[PDB]
Amino acid sequence: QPIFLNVLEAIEPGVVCAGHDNNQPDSFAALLSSLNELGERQLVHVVKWAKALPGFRNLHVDDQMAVIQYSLMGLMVFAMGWRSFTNVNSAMLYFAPDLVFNEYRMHKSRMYSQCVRMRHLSQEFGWLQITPQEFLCMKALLLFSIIPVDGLKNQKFFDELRMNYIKELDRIIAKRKNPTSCSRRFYQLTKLLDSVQPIARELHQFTFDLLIKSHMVSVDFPEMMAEIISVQVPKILSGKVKPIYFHT
Amino acid sequence: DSAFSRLYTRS
Numbered sequence: 274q275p276i277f278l279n280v281l282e283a284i285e286p287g288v289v290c291a292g293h294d295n296n297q298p299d300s301f302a303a304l305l306s307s308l309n310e311l312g313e314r315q316l317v318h319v320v321k322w323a324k325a326l327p328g329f330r331n332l333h334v335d336d337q338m339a340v341i342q343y344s345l346m347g348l349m350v351f352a353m354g355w356r357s358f359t360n361v362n363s364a365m366l367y368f369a370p371d372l373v374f375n376e377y378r379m380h381k382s383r384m385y386s387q388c389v390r391m392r393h394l395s396q397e398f399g400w401l402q403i404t405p406q407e408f409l410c411m412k413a414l415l416l417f418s419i420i421p422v423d424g425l426k427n428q429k430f431f432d433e434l435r436m437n438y439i440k441e442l443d444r445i446i447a448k449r450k451n452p453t454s455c456s457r458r459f460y461q462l463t464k465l466l467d468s469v470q471p472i473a474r475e476l477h478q479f480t481f482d483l484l485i486k487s488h489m490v491s492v493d494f495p496e497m498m499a500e501i502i503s504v505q506v507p508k509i510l511s512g513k514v515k516p517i518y519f520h521t
Numbered sequence: 522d523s524a525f526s527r528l529y530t531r532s
């Protein structure tokens with residue numbers, strides 16, 4: 274009875290729409306105002322998703338809040354690369370059904386480097402034959418992959434939680450009938466996971482810079498995302514809060 | 522700060 278995995282499938286957010294006006298010709302300000310608003314909408318779903326994850330109440334409430342804010346970008350990216358793989362086979366970026374980026378939009382957004390990388394990623398879901406159940410567990414582990422150098426309020430409990438999510442991914446790995454095939458798979462998946470973090474880093478750096486000059490470029494930030502960018506994000510960019518990398 | 526706390530405390 275795959276209890277952990279039933280839960281992940283049970284709690285998985287459904288489709289979220291950006292509200293972008295696709296009938297207007299593409300502008301940078303409107304594309305990014307629509308991404309910012311999509312970000313907030315996806316955030317609301319991530320909070321409800323996270324709070325219903327196995328063990329999550331083990332966490333101190335402040336840690337609960339902190340890891341959601343820190344991991345948000347990496348989660349969005351990961352799920353987006355999967356959405357782009359499943360729906361359109363990596364030919365475009367399926368940010369949402371009403372906000373799909375072709376290469377013209379990738380360039381018009383001014384995050385082309387990041388967009389092409391998220392396209393690398395989307396294609397790896399196919400190349401590595403990632404199963405839906407590998408995706409779900411991987412996405413969960415991602416929520417517990419970014420910690421502060423000064424420590425959480427209860428670091429022991431987070432460390433127990435991460436260990437056990439890694440356990441679950443081990444069990445998922447295990448077709449089974451070969452430890453060496455299990456390791457090869459483990460290597461590949463953890464490498465895929467690690468590669469989400471530089472992308473989120475580039476994306477964080479870009480949105481930081483975009484907020485700071487947003488009045489200059491008529492890009493609107495919702496209240497909440499402006500707080501997160503200005504309050505949590507710089508902790509990541511300043512090196513106070515760091516991804517946990519499997520490799521080096 | 523309070524905007525994300527409030528979301529988190531609410532839905």
Ligand SMILES: C[C@](O)(CS(=O)(=O)c1ccc(F)cc1)C(=O)Nc1ccc(C#N)c(C(F)(F)F)c1
Nearest residue numbers: 308309311312345346349350353368480498501
């Ligand atoms: C530019 C921005 O709007 C910034 S933001 O959404 O306000 C944001 C602010 C703080 C974060 F930690 C993460 C994202 C953004 O990255 N939006 C965005 C929206 C949806 C999706 C998806 N899916 C993604 C991406 F992660 F896939 F790139 C990115």
